[PDB]
Every structure is written in structure tokens, then in C-alpha cells.
Write a protein that binds this ligand. Sequence first.
Ligand SMILES: N[C@H]1[C@@H](OP(=O)(O)O)O[C@H](CO[C@@H]2O[C@H](CO)[C@@H](OP(=O)(O)O)[C@H](O)[C@H]2N)[C@@H](O)[C@@H]1O
Lengths: 222, 214
Amino acid sequence: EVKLVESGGGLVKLGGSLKLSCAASGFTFSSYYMSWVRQTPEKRLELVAAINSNGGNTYYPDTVKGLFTISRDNAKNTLYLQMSRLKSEDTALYYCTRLYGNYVRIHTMDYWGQGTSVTVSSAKTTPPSVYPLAPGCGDTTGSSVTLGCLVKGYFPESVTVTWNSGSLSSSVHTFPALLQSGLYTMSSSVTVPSSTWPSETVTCSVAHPASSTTVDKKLEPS
Amino acid sequence: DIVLTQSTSSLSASLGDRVTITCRASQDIRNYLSWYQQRPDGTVKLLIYYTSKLHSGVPSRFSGSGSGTDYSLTITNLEQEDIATYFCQQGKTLPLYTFGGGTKLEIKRADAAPTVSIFPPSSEQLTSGGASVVCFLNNFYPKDINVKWKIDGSERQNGVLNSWTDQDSKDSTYSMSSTLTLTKDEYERHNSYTCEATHKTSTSPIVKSFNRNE
Ligand SMILES: N[C@H]1[C@@H](OP(=O)(O)O)O[C@H](CO[C@@H]2O[C@H](CO)[C@@H](OP(=O)(O)O)[C@H](O)[C@H]2N)[C@@H](O)[C@@H]1O
């Protein structure tokens, strides 16, 4: 504290509505301007909306005016953003921020929350297909050996890959997801000593919380 | 509608050196320019506001300067915590704030060649009618790499997905995964499968391969 914690994000259909919330602590909330900033998946930042201390004036850049409504509650230390007729393009990370100014002007954002993810899309929720990646044949067997797990055709984000190794150790590369034919594909790799596999069983477990699914796939040498 | 341009998208530097990032406004913002640091996990902190004022708790090796339309952020004696993306923001008139597009700050290290692994499709994926060939290229430096796929002596980009990690916080290397997505029939059409890397660590292409007929 100063601390800002967003909530209410998730998956919404095209043309849907959503309300985010942000709880503030560690300062005198009612003394500060506040705003919502969003960061697109292409990583561009933009101001969505701002509000003065008592909430009498709100401020929208012509981009957002007004599919978005910003409001606050100075008793409950809470900032809200309400959104309606959402479009694909409103997919982004939404940050709550406290504004700071001098006596003349509000000009900077001195604290930010962690952000809430919002995904706006028509595509149906889909668990991933998970395929083990074992080296095709033959060698070089090599000093260490790299195994993988391809996670394809899922929606929305994200997934979690857990490698069961099982008391070995190994580090893991997780590769960021990409769109392909409407859905996400990602992959994960793990590297182990060659005298260790296929002697030891390796399994990749993939969870997809939006579908509430989990699959375990054994890395078959054959 | 004031435009901010950070012309440099990315830059490399070594630990200890002096690094300067520039921001150009399309008009006079009268020193109402701020600098933010975004980490790969998405945490954003304010570093510097009103051109040169340090936010509380920010290390004194960050400084800012400028006026009119031209501003910059300098990091003296770079530390690994400073690897991050840096954004400028003009705040002259609420709600007309604009941000620059960001400048990625990468740590320099010795050239490192990629450990390449190629993976045929599992018979499980083939059973379902799909066929994705995957190549991993791990722990390399520098970031610039050109992977392509050759199939029966024909280069292919259609259906190719490439995904890069961030710089690793422990060895400062990069990794990437290239996946060639095909139908089972497209896959069976051909026999020779090559994941070919072009990287400054090798004079000639680093290649990994297999034949379908095995
Ligand atoms: N007329 C005042 C006004 O000029 P203008 O905004 O129209 O360009 O603001 C000037 C800048 O004020 C300084 O703003 C700093 C940023 O907030 C502030 O530092 P702190 O916030 O750390 O306290 C500083 O105290 C302000 N004086 C001002 O010079 C003009 O007088």
C-alpha cells in the first residue's frame, strides 16, 4: 500500500457487457483522481477513462465516449469500469491507476494495479489437444535430451503446463501462445539428462481453467 | 491528439553501462512527460514524472531530461533489474494523455548457439488427421535468428508459427519454438523434413531433419 487490485475480468461474447472493480488501499482514496488504462496484446498503452476525486467529473478520450462508464465509491475505496457493446478490439489488459497532479493540472499515473485480462470473442470455449513431443529417430542422442508438449486448438487463454519428471530436475521453457485458425496454440519444452530418459517416465499435464479440464500425456519414446 | 514516438523499439546494453531512451512529442508538452517501467510479468511502475522528478523509492541511477518536444530517460550503471520495457507518457491535458510505443531494454552477453531439436508428429495426432512438425531452438544469443522449414527441397512459411521466450533472467539467452502445421495428407505428400536455422554463431545453416518413411 499504496495498493490497487483489479477484478472482474474474463471472457465475454461480442457485444457483451462487463464491470471491472478495483480496490484501493494505503491512501486517502477520495483525495485522488483515478483512471483506467488498457494495454492491448500488441503492447500499446492507452487511457480509457479518468475520474476526479468526488466523481462529479468524468473524462473519456473520443475512443471510448461512451461505451465505457467510470465511477467510484469514496466510502468503500472502490473504482469501477463498466463496458457495453464490447468488440474484439476491446481485448486487452485493464489497469486501474491513481492519478497525480500539481496545483494546476493532473498529469501522471503514480501507482498501477497488476491488471485484469479481458477477452472479447465469439469463439466457443474449447479445451486443448495435447500432443507429446519425443524425438523422432534416430540420434544424435546428445548429452541432454529435450522433450516437448504441443498444446493446440484451445480458447480462451490461458493454459498451464506442469511437467512430472518426477524427482529429477529439469528446466522448462514455456512458449507464448499464438492464434491459428481461430484458436490458440502454445508449446512447452523440458530438458533432462540423456541417461535419465526414456528410463524415467515423463508426463506433461495441461490444465485449461476456462473449460475446467486437465489431461496428462506420457512422453512415449515410440 | 499529441503523438509520442519512441523511435528505438529495442536496445542492447551491458551491465554497468549508460543507457539513454528518447521520446519525441509532435508538439510542446511543457515538461509534462513521464516514464514508466513495465516488467515481463506486467507490473508497471512510475519512475519519473514532470520530465526529471523521481517517484518515491525509485533508484537514483534513473534520470530524465528534456523540454519542448524532446525528452529522454537515462539509466546510469545498468543493473539486471533494469531489463524491462520503458514507456513515455505526456499528460498536458486530461483526458488527452498519450503514450509512446515502448522501448525494450535487453542485457548483452556472449554469442550462444541454439540447441535445436526437431519432432515428427506423434501417431496420436496423425490418427486424428493432423500433423504438426515442431522445432525447438533453445538458449541462444543473439535474438536475431532465421528459422525456415524445407520439405523435399521447397521452403515453406505457410502454416508456420514461431514463438520466442523473453530473455532468460538466469543466462540472458533466448529460446523459440517453430511449428509447422499441416494436414496428415499434406504431411504425407513429402518425405524430407528440415528445420533450418540461420544464426551468427555458425558460418553455415544449423539444420535438423528427418525422413517421414523413417
Ligand atoms: N503556472 C504553474 C504551472 O505552469 P504550467 O502547468 O501551465 O506549465 O505548473 C508549473 C509546474 O509545476 C510544478 O509541477 C511539478 C509536477 O507535479 C511539481 O513537483 P511535485 O509534484 O513533485 O511537488 C512542482 O512542485 C510544481 N511547481 C509551475 O512551474 C507553474 O508555476
